[PDB]
Design a protein around this ligand. Structure first.
Ligand code: CDL
Ligand code: CDL
Ligand code: HEA
Ligand code: HEA
Ligand code: PEK
Ligand code: PGV
Ligand code: DMU
Ligand code: DMU
Ligand code: DMU
Ligand code: DMU
Ligand code: CHD
Ligand code: CHD
Ligand code: LFA
Ligand code: CUA
Ligand code: CU
Ligand code: MG
Ligand code: NA
Ligand code: ZN
Lengths: 102, 56, 227, 72, 49, 513, 40, 44, 137, 44, 70
């Protein structure tokens, strides 16, 4: 089920001592699927980036969420809406806020 | 006859840098030169024959 | 005969060529559709930023990919084989004519009743009468009765040739030591052209076939005149 | 291995059976029975059969198996 | 960082297309190639017999 | 050192390089012959003034393109380069015999070019049917030199097939089953099995023709109780497998190319692709008489050969749909090799479909020995083989050389070649339907327009060939050395760098169970 | 694929030379034979 | 095991996978298969 | 280099195996030290600098469309045009006259004879002639 | 034997102009050969 | 506030929609082709032969001088 898939990926990124290899393996695996990851999954991955002192990877994860949506323009702004409290809490600037959307 | 395979093993394993087709000694060189001379000479003769046969 | 800028078959002169035209129309519609589907699907696969790069399960889709092509092939083969068995069906011919291939001309033998035989050579371009067709005319045409079942027997006195008349649906190899049979029936009078259709050496391009289809009464008058 | 023999079972052997089933299916349907001729080398009766009336073969089909006196 | 395509692509496309059409039209119409088109709606049939 | 390395090779990579050079040279010969064909046909009348020479050119065109360009490039070149690398093997099983498979080809080619230079040539067609190919209608040495050319080519390929089958079965890592080998390796193993079984039958048939020409045998001579049709059965028993031999390595390269440039780790439906290639290989031995629908065989025989031939579309369609399903969801890299592969999928499909039209014996009566057949095989074989070769060549050139091509030039090359082959061959369908025979030096006037266009197309492809030579020069001239390529985790042939060292896998891969 | 900069870059002018010489190597010999077919 | 400081590993991540995952394994800290995360350690 | 992990900008491999920049100056090392504290205390320019140490191109950069199609299509048309020059040369210097059967008067006679023998009278040819009005339909 | 780019081939790429001459002779000889064989047969 | 858009199976949804569209187009083409080609051809042959007089056709050809034998 969708709920069980999402729960497993939240658990994966929530492991306190997740290492850099596991963060990369998780994101590189997840973006192979026919889906844009749920905000709860991205929230967990962004907090992993914080535990790993990796600001750049947090920005890259927001870029690949936008990318996975393809022409479905409504997905990225919905995701950023849902992540706003976490972005504010962790001081994560969006790619747009950084000019990296060119 | 006596089993002289060990003596041939020693000859063909000698660290002399020779490829296996020349490792038996001077007779290998002679047989190689006869073979290659007949092959190359024969091939040149086949081309001459082609030249002859290409015209009435 | 063919005409300039022709895309398809010569107009059918025999019932079996008519059948072949209808069967080709059916088959070409399938060829077009499958060609077009493959091109369309290529374009569909190549026109999205959406991705799915993880392992995909193939089992379900391979049922569609084998069953649907099997059905299509059956739908081609059924009418194909119906025509094959029609073109073999026992007919009672009223006439047998032999043709022998040679390097490079045809001979014809009408030996049902009289020993009539003659040779049939291409008219050289320098000898064509005004309005006659380059590489297609012969000196002696194959005079035959229209609207009658004719048995053609085909052989060769030298190398392989092949006796063809596209508008009648005919092509039978001419093999020395072998007597190959085909059936000819023209729905119409007129002149019907074909060309040698097995490479037989330097003048393969230059040993055509010309049938002259006339009413039975005129065929009989022609036969009687030949005595 | 088992994997290779399963591959042969599903990939070659059963497809062959399906094709021969298709072939048989297409050529099914009754052919016109031949004129009865009381040939003396056929419909042999040297002793009555041990079932029925003694004059019918074990898997007698009235449509295609004439008796010594002809079709039923 | 403008590349070769940014600098020359427009010129290559316009000059290539112009040259290609002009030379094929000349070849097709001006050097006596016999296309042998259909006589339908083109040829007036003339007595041959 | 130069003679030891290049005349006395026991190295799979150097022998692969020799085959690629040989094949590229043969391709120039074959192309020149093809342009002479289309120059003779490019306006009505005679150009050469000698129809025997036209027939010699057609015959040589086919033998050069099949035996000296396609098979050497696909099997000798890509096969020798890639197969050992893709299974982590240190070389071929028989590295010295491998070198003789190569060195038989220059003599084979010399015999073919001797055939064309003595007497009036072998104007037979590549089928070499008696009695035209016999000692009356083709007296003198030309046909015998053609037969001997084919004997040497046949020995080369039989010994090569033994080498590839042994290598692929015996020299994988001990943990790697056959079902863990890449599709290109499968395609070469299957091709090799077809060669091993088919070439000996050709060898028997052409040997019979040799003895009918020189030892007063009558296998094919009715005066002695022989039969020209027996030759046709023996030739085509080889010749149908041969057309699958020409395409199968191409199917293997296409699978690798489509997977690579779709950004995938694997082709869609691996076991279906293996099944389809084995099914095509098997069915390829039971269909040959579709080359003989006009020779006078029995109706039930025609019915069987129609039906068996149509079956090949099913496994073939699984491969085409599987390539499409490999693109599906890809991060597509529009590389020149990807363009070659997409051109392949479409043009192969068109040619395969006109094959299905021809499989219908009834319609084949009217299409046999016409330009419809020429159109069919120039789509599926000529474009299919050549597009797979050019895709493999631009994909793997950096592996083999250590240098990159100019991608923009390679895309221009593709675009020119796509226009040229379609302008050349598409109109030949109309010529066939309207009844123009093949193997003709001239045609009735009605056929002028489509012959004119076809011949103009042939020059466009020539421009593409010349540009290809410039593109290879420019890569060797500029010396852009490769650093990295992506997807090495699923493309083992790249993991030793570009070019790989003379000896690779001295220490084999570690693969556990 | 990633690569080092060209060791021996081939300028536009160098490419025009190589392209020209390549085309001429194909066209001149065949052209000579085809021009002289009459003489044959 | 290796006679040197690196060796190519192929990982068949699951039984009956047709896809083998290839990578150089270097001397030092254990590396992981990039597909399944299986650990490998070189032992010169 | 072939045997080591490498950097790749690929939309489907967003977190590559190595950082774009392997060897840091003292200022870049201090910024990585700063990265261990609150990111809210990081400036915009510092956030962009951390991104550029880790990655070479952004998604927007790696995904950009190019003008290459113009060069490819234009160059292909140039070489196809060059081909017509070869065909003009062939027509001028290789091809002699075509047969007299292509002369206007021969074609007019040949066309009448084709209509008189009713070539392709169902669809192909004679079908397009009006035999009542003595003109093309 | 010599290893690496430009060293695993039976021809030199040391000089791009010598290379152009060798490639010209190589592919040109193959392309020319059928024209000269046709000429040889016609001159019989 | 923005509502949740579909985030799962976007590639599969696109494929399904366009495979159905390709089917519908194939049906429309089969209808065009039956009318423009296959039925056109059946009707042309049937119309030609419905009142066809082979003797009158022969007499026209003979008067035009086409035949060797008549
Ligand atoms: C790129 C490089 C350049 C390309 C090369 C250029 C080639 C020359 C162009 C051809 C144009 C022909 C023309 O004058 O068209 C007039 C012609 C006028 O129509 P018409 O005279 O009334 O013909 C109706 C016939 O009764 C119709 O019946 P018919 O029996 O007379 O015609 C049958 C015939 C004629 O078929 C056709 O009508 C044309 C074929 C389609 C071309 C695409 O079709 C064939 O059998 C051809 C064999 C094709 C094999 C399979 C090909 C797969 C196609 C791939 C699909 C991709 C989709 C995009 O218009 C066309 O049909 C267009 C062609
Ligand atoms: C009908 C017959 C069939 C014929 C088919 C022909 C096609 C088959 C080709 C197969 C390749 C044969 C290679 C065997 C060894 C070559 C021997 C030789 O003559 O060397 C000179 C020559 C290289 O000259 P170089 O640059 O001075 O290199 C010398 C060494 O670096 C420095 O080493 P070194 O100083 O120790 O020794 C070099 C020196 C002398 O060294 C020696 O001691 C060697 C002496 C024995 C060699 C005998 C070779 C026999 C070849 C038979 C053909 C096979 O060589 C010379 O400079 C003078 C020799 C010139 C002889 C001409 C041979 C040309 C090949 C055949 C062309 C066809 C002509 C037929 C005419 C047709 C008329 C109807 O070797 C070649 O023939 C190489 C091919 C020519 C260049 C082609 C470039 C094309 C690139 C396109 C790439 C497409 C493939 C992708 C590859 C992937 C990248 C990895
Ligand atoms: C690459 C080489 C190659 C390949 C692969 C093929 C593939 C096929 N060929 Fe062809 N063929 C030749 C090379 C090739 N051929 C050559 C050289 C000749 C001439 C020899 C000579 O005389 O000189 C020839 C001649 C030849 C003839 C003899 C014609 C004659 O001389 O009168 C026939 C007869 O059936 C034939 C049929 C086929 C068929 C049915 C296939 C099939 O394998 C095609 C299968 C492919 C597809 C069908 C397309 C993909 C499928 C799908 C997208 C699925 C759905 C499709 C359907 C439901 C139909 N070909
Ligand atoms: C692989 C097989 C193949 C290939 C590639 C070709 C390529 C070409 N062929 Fe054909 N041809 C045949 C196989 C092939 N042919 C066969 C079997 C016959 C029948 C013979 C007979 O009837 O007996 C035939 C017959 C045939 C005829 C019919 C002759 C007749 O019936 O009278 C025609 C007519 O136009 C023709 C034209 C062409 C043209 C214009 C090309 C090409 O010009 C099309 C463009 C392709 C290229 C120019 C090739 C490019 C490749 C290279 C240069 C290799 C590069 C190498 C590396 C990158 C490593 N060929
Ligand atoms: C689906 C097929 C499977 C077969 C099963 C069917 C029948 C019973 C058992 C069969 C055993 C095999 C052979 C015995 C002999 C004859 C039967 C042959 C097979 C059969 O069933 O033949 C039938 C006749 O059966 C008859 O006579 C019937 C005869 C019944 C009695 C048989 C007598 C037993 C013979 C003794 C056996 C001796 C064994 C010796 C062992 C060796 C020891 C050293 C054929 O039917 P039909 O109507 O003539 O023609 C068809 C017309 N539509
Ligand atoms: C008109 C006349 C035309 C005919 C021309 C004849 C053609 C060519 C001339 C033949 C010259 C032959 C010279 C000997 C070849 C020996 C090959 C051999 O024996 O090859 C072996 C492999 O093939 C094996 O085993 C099994 C394979 C062994 C095959 C032996 C040679 C066969 C040659 C002809 C075969 C035709 C087949 C007939 C069927 C059509 C050894 O492989 P290598 O790579 O060497 O070494 C590997 C090392 O590990 C060994 O220590
Ligand atoms: C012929 C053109 C294209 C055909 C493409 C057919 C591909 C079928 C894909 C099947 O793969 C599945 O996709 C689903 C997600 O959508 C996953 O959930 C499932 O696990 C996966 O196996
Ligand atoms: C009728 C004639 C019409 C003109 C046709 C001209 C066709 C050639 C166009 C040039 O194309 C470019 O050439 C660059 C220069 O080689 C390539 O960059 C390559 O060159 C350098 C390596 O030395 C690096 O800067 C690049 O990364 C590298 O990809 C680049 O890919 C390519 O698009
Ligand atoms: C199928 C592939 C072929 C494609 C066509 C090739 C395109 C033509 C290339 C040019 O070839 C040359 O053409 C010249 C004419 O333009 C010839 O000069 C010939 O004619 C000249 C002018 O009449 C004389 O000055 C020369 O002596 C005389 O050899 C010359 O021999 C020949 O090399
Ligand atoms: C008769 C046959 C005709 C064949 C003609 C061949 C035409 C090929 C034109 C190539 O032009 C370019 O193609 C690139 C790729 O080759 C494009 O990359 C862009 O588009 C792609 C998306 O479709 C992306 O993958 C790339 O990253 C992106 O930069 C690029 O913008 C475009 O200028
Ligand atoms: C005496 C000698 C021993 C050989 C040995 O062990 O070296 C024997 C053993 C087997 C003998 C061979 C076998 O007996 C078979 C053959 C018998 C014939 O009568 C003589 C030749 C013949 C071919 C023998 C030659 C020779 O006498 C051999 C070789
Ligand atoms: C059984 C075998 C291997 C499975 C495996 O071990 O991975 C698979 C591989 C390819 C399969 C075949 C291909 O997918 C093509 C056919 C697809 C149909 O849906 C069933 C029959 C069909 C003919 C398949 C039967 C069987 O499932 C095959 C033969
Ligand atoms: C592991 C071995 C794989 C070999 C497969 C070969 C498949 C082609 C079959 C040819 C059979 C000949 C039929 C007559
Ligand atoms: Cu007689 Cu061809
Ligand atoms: Cu075949
Ligand atoms: Mg034939
Ligand atoms: Na001609
Ligand atoms: Zn793994």
């Amino acid at each position: 089920t969708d709920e069980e898939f999402d729960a497993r990926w939240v658990t994966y990124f929530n492991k306190p001592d997740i290492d850099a290899w596991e963060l990369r393996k998780g994101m590189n695996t997840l973006v192979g699927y026919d889906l844009v990851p749920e905000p709860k999954i991205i929230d967990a991955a962004l907090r992993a980036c914080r535990r790993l002192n990796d600001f750049a990877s947090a920005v890259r994860i927001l870029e690949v969420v936008k990318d996975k949506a393809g022409p479905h323009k409504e997905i990225y702004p919905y995701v950023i809406q849902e992540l706003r409290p976490t972005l504010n809490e962790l001081g994560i600037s969006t790619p747009e806020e950084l000019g990296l959307d060119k | 006859f006596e089993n002289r395979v060990a003596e041939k093993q020693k000859l063909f394993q000698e660290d002399n840098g020779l490829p296996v087709h020349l490792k038996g000694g001077a007779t290998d060189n002679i047989l190689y030169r006869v073979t290659m001379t007949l092959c190359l000479g024969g091939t040149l003769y086949s081309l001459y024959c082609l030249g002859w046969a290409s015209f009435p | 005969m063919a005409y300039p800028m022709q895309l398809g078959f010569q107009d059918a002169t025999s019932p079996i060529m008519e059948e072949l035209l209808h069967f080709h129309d059916h088959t070409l519609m399938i060829v077009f559709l499958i060609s077009s589907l493959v091109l369309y699907i290529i374009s569909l696969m190549l026109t999205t930023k959406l991705t799915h790069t993880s392992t995909m399960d193939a089992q379900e889709v391979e049922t569609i990919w084998t069953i649907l092509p099997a059905i299509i092939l059956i739908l081609i083969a059924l009418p194909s084989l119906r025509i094959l068995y029609m073109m073999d069906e026992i007919n009672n011919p009223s006439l047998t004519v032999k043709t022998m291939g040679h390097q490079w001309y045809w001979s014809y033998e009408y030996t049902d009743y009289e020993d009539l035989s003659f040779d049939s050579y291409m008219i050289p371009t320098s000898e064509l009468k005004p309005g006659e067709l380059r590489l297609l005319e012969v000196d002696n045409r194959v005079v035959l009765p229209m609207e009658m079942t004719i048995r053609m027997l085909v052989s060769s006195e030298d190398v392989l040739h092949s006796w063809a008349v596209p508008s009648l649906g005919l092509k039978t190899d001419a093999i020395p030591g072998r007597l190959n049979q085909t059936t000819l029936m023209s729905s119409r009078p007129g002149l019907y052209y074909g060309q040698c259709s097995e490479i037989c050496g330097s003048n393969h391009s230059f040993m055509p076939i010309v049938l002259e289809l006339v009413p039975l009464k005129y065929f009989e008058k022609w036969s009687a005149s030949m005595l | 291995g088992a994997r290779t023999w399963r591959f042969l079972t599903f990939g070659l052997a059963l497809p062959s059976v399906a094709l021969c089933t298709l072939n048989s299916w297409l050529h099914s349907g009754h052919r016109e029975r031949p004129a009865f001729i009381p040939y003396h080398h056929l419909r042999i009766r040297t002793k009555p059969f041990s079932w029925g009336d003694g004059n019918h073969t074990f898997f007698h089909n009235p449509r295609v198996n004439p008796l010594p006196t002809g079709y039923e | 960082a403008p590349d070769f395509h940014d600098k020359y692509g427009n010129a290559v496309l316009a000059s290539g297309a112009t040259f290609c059409v002009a030379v094929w039209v000349y070849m097709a119409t001006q050097i006596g190639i016999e296309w042998n088109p259909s006589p339908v709606g083109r040829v007036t049939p003339k007595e041959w017999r | 050192m130069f003679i030891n390395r290049w005349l006395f090779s026991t190295n799979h990579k150097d022998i692969g390089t020799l085959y690629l050079l040989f094949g590229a040279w043969a391709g120039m010969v074959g192309t020149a012959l093809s342009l002479l064909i289309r120059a003779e046909l490019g306006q009505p009348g005679t150009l050469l003034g000698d129809d025997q020479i036209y027939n010699v050119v057609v015959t040589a065109h086919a033998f050069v393109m099949i035996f000296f360009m396609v098979m050497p490039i696909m099997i000798g070149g890509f096969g020798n380069w890639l197969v050992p690398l893709m299974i982590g093997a240190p070389d071929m099983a028989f590295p010295r015999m491998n070198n003789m498979s190569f060195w038989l080809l220059p003599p084979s080619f010399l015999l073919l070019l001797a055939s064309s230079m003595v007497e009036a040539g072998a104007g037979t067609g590549w089928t070499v049917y008696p009695p035209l190919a016999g000692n009356l209608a083709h007296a003198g040495a030309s046909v015998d030199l053609t037969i001997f050319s084919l004997h040497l080519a046949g020995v080369s390929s039989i010994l090569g097939a033994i080498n590839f089958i042994t290598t692929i079965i015996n020299m994988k890592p001990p943990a790697m089953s056959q079902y863990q080998t890449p599709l290109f390796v499968w395609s070469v193993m299957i091709t090799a099995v077809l060669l091993l079984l088919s070439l000996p039958v050709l060898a028997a048939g052409i040997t019979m023709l040799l003895t009918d020409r020189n030892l007063n045998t009558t296998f094919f001579d009715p005066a002695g109780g022989g039969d020209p049709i027996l030759y046709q059965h023996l030739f085509w028993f080889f010749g149908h497998p041969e057309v699958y031999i020409l395409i199968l390595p191409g199917f293997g390269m296409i699978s690798h190319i489509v997977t690579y440039y779709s950004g995938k780790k694997e082709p869609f439906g691996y076991m279906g692709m293996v099944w389809a290639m084995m099914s095509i290989g098997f069915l390829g031995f039971i269909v040959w008489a579709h080359h003989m629908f006009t020779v006078g065989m029995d109706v039930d025989t025609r019915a069987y050969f129609t039906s068996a031939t149509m079956i090949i579309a099913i496994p073939t369609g699984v491969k085409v749909f599987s390539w499409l399903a490999t693109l599906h969801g890809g991060n597509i890299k529009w590389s020149p090799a990807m363009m070659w592969a997409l051109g392949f999928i479409f043009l192969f499909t068109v040619g395969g479909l006109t094959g299905i039209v021809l499989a219908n014996s009834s319609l084949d009566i009217v299409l046999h020995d016409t330009y419809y057949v020429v159109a069919h095989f120039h789509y599926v074989l000529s474009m299919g083989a050549v597009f797979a070769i050019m895709g493999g060549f631009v994909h793997w050139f950096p592996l083999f050389s250590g240098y990159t091509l100019n991608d923009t030039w390679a895309k221009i090359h593709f675009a020119i070649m796509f226009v040229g082959v379609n302008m050349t061959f598409f109109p030949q369908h109309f010529l066939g339907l309207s009844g123009m025979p093949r193997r003709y030096s001239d045609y009735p006037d009605a056929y002028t327009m489509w012959n004119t266009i076809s011949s103009m197309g042939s020059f466009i492809s020539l421009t593409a060939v010349m540009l290809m030579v410039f593109i290879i020069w420019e890569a060797f001239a500029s010396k852009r050395e490769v650093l990295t390529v992506d997807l090495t985790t699923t493309n083992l042939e790249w993991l030793n760098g570009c070019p790989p060292p003379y000896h690779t896998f001295e220490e084999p891969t570690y693969v556990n169970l | 694929i990633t690569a080092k900069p060209a060791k021996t870059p081939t300028s536009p002018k160098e490419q025009a030379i190589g392209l020209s010489v390549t085309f001429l190597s194909f066209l001149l010999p065949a052209g000579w034979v085809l021009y002289h077919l009459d003489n044959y | 095991p290796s006679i040197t400081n690196k060796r190519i590993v192929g990982c068949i991540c699951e039984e009956d996978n047709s896809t083998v995952i290839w990578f150089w394994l270097h001397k030092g800290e254990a590396q992981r298969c990039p597909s399944c995360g299986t650990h490998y350690k070189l032992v010169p | 280099d072939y045997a080591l992990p490498s950097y790749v900008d690929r939309r489907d491999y967003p977190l590559p195996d190595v950082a774009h920049v392997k060897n840091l100056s003292a200022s870049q090392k201090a910024l990585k030290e700063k990265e261990k504290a609150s990111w809210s205390s990081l400036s915009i320019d510092e956030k962009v600098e951390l991104y550029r140490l880790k990655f070479k191109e952004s998604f927007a950069e790696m995904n950009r469309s190019t003008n290459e199609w113009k060069t490819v299509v234009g160059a292909a048309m140039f070489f196809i045009g060059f081909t017509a020059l070869l065909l003009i040369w062939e027509k001028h210097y290789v091809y002699g006259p075509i047969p007299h059967t292509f002369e206007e008067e021969w074609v007019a006679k040949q066309t009448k004879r084709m209509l008189d023998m009713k070539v392709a009278p169902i669809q192909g040819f004679s079908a397009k002639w009006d035999y009542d009005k003595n003109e093309w339909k | 034997y010599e290893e690496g780019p430009g060293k695993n081939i039976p021809f030199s790429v040391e000089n791009k102009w010598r290379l152009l001459a060798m490639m010209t002779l190589f592919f040109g000889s193959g392309f020319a050969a059928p024209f000269f064989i046709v000429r040889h047969q016609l001159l019989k | 506030a923005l509502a949740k858009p579909q985030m799962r199976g976007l590639l599969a949804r696109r494929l399904r929609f366009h495979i159905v569209g390709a089917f519908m187009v194939s049906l429309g083409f089969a209808t065009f082709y039956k009318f423009a080609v296959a039925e056109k051809r059946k009707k042309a042959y049937a119309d030609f032969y419905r009142n066809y007089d082979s003797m009158k056709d022969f007499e026209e050809m003979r008067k035009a001088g086409i035949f060797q034998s008549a």
